Amino acid sequence: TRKAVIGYYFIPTNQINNYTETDTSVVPFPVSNITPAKAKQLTHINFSFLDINSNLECAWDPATNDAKARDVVNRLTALKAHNPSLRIMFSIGGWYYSNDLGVSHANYVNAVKTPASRAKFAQSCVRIMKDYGFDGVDIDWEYPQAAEVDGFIAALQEIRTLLNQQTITDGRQALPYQLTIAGAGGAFFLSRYYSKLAQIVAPLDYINLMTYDLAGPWEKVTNHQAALFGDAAGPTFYNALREANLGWSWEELTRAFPSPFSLTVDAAVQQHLMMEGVPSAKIVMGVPFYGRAFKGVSGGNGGQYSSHSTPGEDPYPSTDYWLVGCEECVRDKDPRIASYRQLEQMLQGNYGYQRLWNDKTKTPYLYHAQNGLFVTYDDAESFKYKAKYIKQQQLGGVMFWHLGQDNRNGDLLAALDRYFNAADYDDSQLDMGTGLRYTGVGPGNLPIMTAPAYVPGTTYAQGALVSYQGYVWQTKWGYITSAPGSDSAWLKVGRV
């Protein structure tokens, strides 16, 4: 099965309202930049972002010029002429609109509240999809909280019901309408809805993990924002999942959620695979087409794992654009984020940056020894290991933010496509390294094991293993006189 390659196309309301493909000063990345070749390397483009309004319906920014919006969307759907598998999805939400303190947060909470609010909301998503010509719905609420999760799940189920009906009504069996969400790629936010992951993923074609922004100026020490595996020399974090609303025992929580742990892409993927009912084929690994920069770092590990003096607030609370050579940072008034396109230009500009590589995390980073700057980012090299992991772990594919950040030749996208699809690319010998793997074990990823059938009437010693009801169990202490599932002394440790 072809791996999904999902790229976000984000365009601010002012750029839509002033849309032009001939003046990068107004619209830095117009649709025309997505050439036929690039359209063929994508399976999905997530047009972003739409929102949920006070009327609790899916809707465009109230300030959007609808006729201009329709034309931009039509340009995107026109790309399907070059790739019959291409889908132009539209994304609802994003951090700005939906975070707990975001401008539209209450609308998300209220829209999933009742059977009626959900029906109205689901209907609006499908109506918007059909009216503008989109191929599916992607919801990026960052993020529903424990008490809102059942409502969220029910809303997704409703949209799924309506989309499947629309697929048949439109004769779209060959390319069914889809439903996806952008899911948390870090344990802290993930813990909000983790316990009900299976129910959340059931109505989805994919859950696209935001497995990046795992480091930022909001953290005390610099770190890689999307390390594939862990580096023992780097910072470790509290494993929030042990506090998720699971109802599991201490042994179960402990074995599934070691703490502290390394916040990496592998951790997030493995945490999802640990839940039963969450299929690897629906998990999509997100990757960033941008880097995060920090100032005020010290030497010793090339800028890595160092204290820093970078403001963590949004918007950037200063006028000091200190990321040397980053012209896009001046345009966007924030030196803490730089597109791969800009970083590549900074590297060939002799600005004082050294490109270094961490072979544990399998990610590159820049160090500016003169100015004390550190940049964590991803590139065509880190993408080889992530692509191999996606294939080995049988994931659904890759997602990335965002298309306008790739370089002019579309090298990052081309690399992802190459790694999955090129007949002459062979990563059989690619060394995945010795970085730390997440070793938690849960209901969903128990190892295959064998053990004698449990025998009623037998008394078991501590550490004994038996098979019962299709799983292998081990005793937590001795003199066990009742059965697995009915005596708490038994721990499920394997399957089959």
Next chain:
Amino acid sequence: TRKAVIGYYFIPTNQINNYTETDTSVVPFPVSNITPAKAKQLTHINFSFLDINSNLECAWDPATNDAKARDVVNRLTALKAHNPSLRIMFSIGGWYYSNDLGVSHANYVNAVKTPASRAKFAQSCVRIMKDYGFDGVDIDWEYPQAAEVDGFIAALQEIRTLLNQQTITDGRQALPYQLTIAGAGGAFFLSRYYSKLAQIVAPLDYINLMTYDLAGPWEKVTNHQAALFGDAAGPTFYNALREANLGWSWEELTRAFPSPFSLTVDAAVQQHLMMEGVPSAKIVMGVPFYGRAFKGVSGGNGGQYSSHSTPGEDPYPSTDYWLVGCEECVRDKDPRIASYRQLEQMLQGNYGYQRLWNDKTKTPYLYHAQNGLFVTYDDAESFKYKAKYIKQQQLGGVMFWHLGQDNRNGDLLAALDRYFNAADYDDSQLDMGTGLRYTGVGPGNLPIMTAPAYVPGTTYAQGALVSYQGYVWQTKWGYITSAPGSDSAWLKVGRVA
């Protein structure tokens, strides 16, 4: 309120059937050994044991001569003439009958299954109670677990309803019929029903904790079987309550159930107190009137916390009776258990035992340097600390197993009564020691705390404390923008006044 003093009177079916008060080789402990003085020192006598038959009703062992059974019980209820507060309870169950692998275990599981079975069983308990002249029902199922607990709770509730009505019918308001159970005194068995303790205890007058047998040959390291407090030098154990179906977070489980921990009497009592809705007044501390012996122990620490070579199978699989001076052990065929009566004799018999004391656990022990023996037991001195604990912790009283093991003068029973009631006993200056106390805190026994009210729309740093919906909450990590409650970021740490 007077503290309860609940003593078991256990008599095997063969002794009932050949009951005699003039031949200790047939009946070692006849009822006649309970004088008026002893009757006045007790508040309850738990006659044991009755069972639950295949008809799922309370019943005597089928092999019991009924007339002889009534005569033994009559000797016990006649003691009431000497103490108007005394109750002769009858106990249903016990280890032999009710353990998972016991001969009658199925009957316990099936009797509590449905409204009909529970009604039938509860009616039979009250019928036996009235027919034989008992003053209450005590159930000692060791122990219900899983799906059985809800049924058990409903059966207890049903018996309570029937007893209360019987009390009114009989005009027994001055000494109402009572309902109690023997409860696990250790976390492993306690974990079976721990999550529903409040519901189990609601219909009871008392839950009598079997806070003994916390050490035994079944364990690789010798230890005190009923330490009041812990000795950091002794063995520690996995806290099984961490595995009960409580629905608590990892932090809550860890805070409530330190692990490994010292299996002590204080741990069991504190573990019950940690659960919301379990009143200290209903908690009864059990104590043993017998000791457990180990052979093959090493020198150095008086036989304490040493490897040993003591058989663990039951029955005692050997014919070797190695507990020096213990002839009772010969009569009963097991050198691993001895009554306080017999142990006291071994101490007056110049057999080479040293009586030592652990000032952390507040318990005595015997050490036979010559033969490599260790005996853990309780005596009048250890009962001083336990009785003071009962008073300080406002527990309902003390329970013990069993009356036949006290010495002929009834000194252990006399000591307990004295510690609770004698005007001439003063423990105000008795030092409880520095042994390890159980310090778990449960979401159901949080301290009063004070914090600013939670402000919606605020972002909280790690470790911040706020008050919200009756509790004080602490954040487990930073940048918290969610409200306290089920949300993973917040931990209930205190109660708002």
